Amino acid sequence: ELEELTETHNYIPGAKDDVNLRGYLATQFAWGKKVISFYRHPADDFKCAKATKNMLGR
């Protein structure tokens, strides 16, 4: 399984683990306490952009 994470470039620790317990132990005192989202790939980018009647897409 470790080779599968490496060959798919899923090198974000605990992304494919449903309960990233190791991620909670490291963030017990972190600023913006958060754990990685499930199955997050370091290459995916879901960013969007729109143009409105106002500026800055507002």
Ligand X SMILES: CCCCCCCCCCCCCCCCCC(=O)OC[C@H](COP(=O)([O-])OCC[N+](C)(C)C)OC(=O)CCCCCCCCCCCCCCCCC
Least Å distance between CB 8 and ligand CDL? 27
Q: How far apart are the C-alpha atoms of 58 and 47, rounded to whole Å?
A: 16
Question: Tokens representing 34?
Answer: 């958060």
Residues 19-38 as x/- pattern, contact with ligand CDL by CB under 6 A? ----------x-x-------
For ligand X, give the closer residue by CB, 18 or 44. Answer: 44
Closest-CA residue to 13 (of 27, 31, 32): 27
User: Could you give the CA distance from residue 5 to residue 11 in angstroms, rounded to a whole number?
Assistant: 6
Binding site for ligand CDL (CB under 6 A): 29, 31
Binding site for ligand X (CB under 6 A): 31-33
